[PDB]
Amino acid sequence: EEDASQLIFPKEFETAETLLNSEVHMLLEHRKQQNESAEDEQELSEVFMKTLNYTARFSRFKNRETIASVRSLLLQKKLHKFELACLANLCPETAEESKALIPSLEGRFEDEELQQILDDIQTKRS
Amino acid sequence: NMLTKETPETFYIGKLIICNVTGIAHIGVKTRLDNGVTGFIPTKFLSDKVVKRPEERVKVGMTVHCRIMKIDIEKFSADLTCRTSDLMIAHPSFHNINFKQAEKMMETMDQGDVIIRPSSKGENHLTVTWKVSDGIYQHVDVRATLWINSEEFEDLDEIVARYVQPMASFARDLLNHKYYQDCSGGDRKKLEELLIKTKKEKPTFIPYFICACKELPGKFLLGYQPRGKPRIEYVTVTPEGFRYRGQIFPTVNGLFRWFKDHYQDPV
Amino acid sequence: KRITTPYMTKYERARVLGTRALQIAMCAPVMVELEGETDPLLIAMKELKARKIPIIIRRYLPDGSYEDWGVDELIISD
Amino acid sequence: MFYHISLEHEILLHPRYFGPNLLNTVKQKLFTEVEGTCTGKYGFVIAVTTIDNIGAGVIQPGRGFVLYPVKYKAIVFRPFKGEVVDAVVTQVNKVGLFTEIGPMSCFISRHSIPSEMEFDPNSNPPCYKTMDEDIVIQQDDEIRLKIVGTRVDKNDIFAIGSLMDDYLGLV
Amino acid sequence: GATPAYGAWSPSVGSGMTPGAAGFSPSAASD
């Protein structure tokens, strides 16, 4: 029954806080910077390294202010939290591609209304 | 190579090869190696030719590590060297020691020479001892609960220059005081009679003295005689300055200047 | 706004002494200088006399509320 | 998908750890206990960012062990069905494709892949191309996919991908 | 250990009464 396509999740996960690829990337980078210092400490594990090299290959923007602006210009809408991560991470070109990938956008908003948002997201990319 | 399975090509010079000495024919100790090679240690490996066989340099019956300087697995030879060498003002010192024995090397250095040594209470702890006076030494047991971080463990060249050097200078400032005395480490029984023996010679003028205790280092004794009754008042020397009546002064002279204007009250 | 008695009952004193003795027997740091003894129970008694036991008692009330009292806060009976 | 939620956990601390570094020891134990593990309720956990507070240690009766119900603010990665993410291809085999969704590895079969992407066993690097040889997909390429299934192999998540929906390849 | 904390001790101050007059020596300059 758990299918994110139809916007359904358990009660505990419904009250979660979404994270973007750049956000998690910078969080892990800061954690690594803090951990590497303060000698006599247990070093990072393979999980941290794989997550780092996985999120580093999808960092659409390095500036934190870019993350702040792209979340601010998005939260003003009426979309759910789930629509804040996938759409901000994939960064599709045209509205048709976004509507095809995410079935929730089908009929939820107009065409130009989503195309302008996609163009803004593309421009915000570094 | 077909039988032993260990040719001289594998064993190189300089690499330490264990030569298990199990027996000796005449003078040396000819034993077996790890790879089934007859390791014959000549008299040169042990330094014994016309004397008792080398037992301290070559382990008889067991395996003794030595520098491998000969590949003679096929020839039933093992040029393993039995010798260990073959295998191959403000003076902060160091110590890679107990407490009773450490005191034997503290009375020679002059004031200001700080020495760092491990602790003897727990783990990952250190104790900084700095020369205070003749026989008085403060053993700051850093976990004198001096709270610090862990990054300082790498470089220890600033903990003494940030908390010991200024404190040491302030403590030494009192050593050169005009009215200074020791009285056998400043005992409570000997420092009281002096106050009553010195007042009779000058009842009008009430002088003062300063001394540091021996059982509790870091607590000076500033006594005075307001009347015919003695009184004692301790004072602590903090890293930044002093701690008299709860106040902390920046300079050493500040405490003296503030003390000569507050002892007139009836108390 | 604690309304419980400011004295340590015998039950609480006994339980605290026993718990501190058990902790000391399990290689825990002491809170008083040892004069040359080894029995953990004696060390616990000495700490209680010195008022240095790192334990706080939670007296539950009938209604459901509770009050946290520290060994170094209330008066000891014995 | 990565998320930031508030979790809770308790750890017993042996009495030998009592002392001025009690809180530091509790934090150190917490760090090396709830990092990298996985559970079927909240999913795979990456690491811990910060800790909210330290609960009151309730000493157990007749035992020196004391438990601290700490509540830490850590992140979690719990992928669901239907989500679309961007991963990287790790290996190409005739049986199927292998990818790496961060702390998880999925797998897509040839049946899911359209008939246009054929095999290239003759060439040294295993790759899939079309008749015209215009589009090329190989390893170390940011290729998207769809999570159509989930699985937890005893705290080891292993989902399954798919390649039927359009617009799934080079961006 | 046989080397307990020495700087952590609380210096207790002694109380008393001495109704004396003001006839002691003056102060000095801090320079």
Domain boundaries, chain C: 1-78
The Cα D90–Cα D100 span in angstroms is: 7
Residue D90 amino acid letter: T
Residues of C in contact with D64 (CB under 8 A): 22-23, 26, 28
Domain boundaries, chain A: 1-126
Q: Please choose, from the candidates D38, D40, D53, D68, the residue with its C-alpha nearest in 3D space to the C-alpha of residue D6.
A: D53
Three-state DSSP at B8 gives coil
* CATH, residue D148: 2.40.50.140
The CATH code of the domain at C1-78 is 3.90.940.10
Breaks (C-N over 2.5 A) in chain C follow: none
CB count in 10 Å sphere of residue E22: 6
Residues D97, D17, single domain; the answer is no
Distance (Å, whole) CA C76 – CA C9: 8
Q: D18 and C22 in contact by Cβ < 8 A?
A: no
A64-75 helix and A111-124 helix, angle to the nearest 10 degrees: 170
Same domain, D30 and D86: no
3-state SS class at A55: helix
Query: Looking at the domain A1-126, which fold is it?
Result: Growth Hormone; Chain: A; (1.20.1250)
E19 reaches B (C-beta below 8 A): yes
Query: Are residue D123 and residue D45 in the same domain, yes or no?
Result: no
From D80, D104, D121, the end of a domain falls on D80
With a CB cutoff of 8 Å and minimum separation 6, the contacts of C69 are: C2, C4, C56, C57, C58, C59
* Domain final residue, candidates D63, D80, D97: D80
Residues D106 and D56 both lie in one domain: no
User: Nearest-CA residue of chain B relative to A37?
Assistant: B151
As to burial, measured by CB atoms within 10 angstroms (0-12 exposed, 13-18 middle, 19+ buried), residue B54 is: buried
Q: CATH number, domain at D5?
A: 3.30.1490.120
Domain span at D97? 81-171
- DSSP secondary structure letters along B84-134: HHHH-----B-----STTGGGGTSSS-TT-EEEEE-SSSSS-EEEEEE-SS
Considering its fold, how many domains does chain D have in total? 2
How far, in Å, are B113, B128, D120, D157 from residue D80 at the CA level? 67, 58, 33, 11
C54 φ/ψ angles, rounded to the nearest 5 degrees = -80, 65
Tokens encoding D28:
């150190």
Report the DSSP pairing between strands B242-243 and D38-39: unpaired
Closest CA–CA distance from residue D61 to any residue of chain A (Å):
33
> Do D86 and D149 lie in a common domain?
yes
CA triplet B139, B142, B146: central angle to 5 degrees? 105
Q: Does D50 share its domain with D134? A: no
* Cβ within 8 Å of D, A 44-73: 45, 47-48, 50-51, 54-55, 57-58
Residues D87 and D162 in one domain: yes
| Alpha-carbon gap: D15 to the closest alpha carbon of chain C (Å) | 5
Residue of chain E whose Cα is closest to the Cα of B138 = E6
Distance CA C27, CA A18 (A): 46
Q: Tell whether D33 and D115 lie within a shared domain.
A: no
Tally B–E CB contacts below 8 A.
76
Contact B257 E28 (CB under 8 A): yes
Instruction: Indicate if D75 and D86 belong to the same structural domain.
Output: no
Residue D1 to residues A81, B185, D77, D86, D106, Cα–Cα distance (Å): 12, 71, 5, 11, 14
Q: Is there a single domain that holds both residue D87 and residue D126?
A: yes
CA distance B29 to A41: 48
Distance CA B225, CA B208 (A): 8
Burial of residue A107, with CB atoms counted within 10 A of its CB: 0-12 exposed, 13-18 middle, 19 or more buried: exposed
Alpha-carbon span B21 to B24, nearest angstrom: 8
Give me the amino acid identity at D162: S
Q: Where does residue A25 rank: exposed (0-12), middle (13-18), buried (19+ CB within 10 A)?
A: buried
Alpha helices in chain B (DSSP H): 43-46, 84-87, 159-163, 165-175, 183-186, 190-199, 252-259
Reported structure resolution in angstroms:
2.9
Residues of A with Cβ-Cβ distance to D171 under 8 angstroms: 91
Judge contact between D154 and D143, C-beta under 8 A. no
Judge contact between C40 and C22, C-beta under 8 A: yes
Q: Which residues of D touch A47 (CB under 8 A)?
A: 35-36, 46, 103
Which of E2, E3, E30 faces B257 most closely, judged by CB atoms? E30
Tokens of A24: 């998690």
Residue whose structure tokens are 């300079």: B251
Contact by Cβ (8 Å): D109, D101 = no
* Cα–Cα distance for residue pair A111/C56, rounded to 1 Å: 65
Place of tokens 């300063």: B210
Q: Which of D80, D99, D130 is the last residue of a domain?
A: D80
- Classified as helix, coil or strand, A13 is helix
Residue A18 neighbours by CB distance under 10 Å: 18
Return the residue matching tokens 């110590």: B95
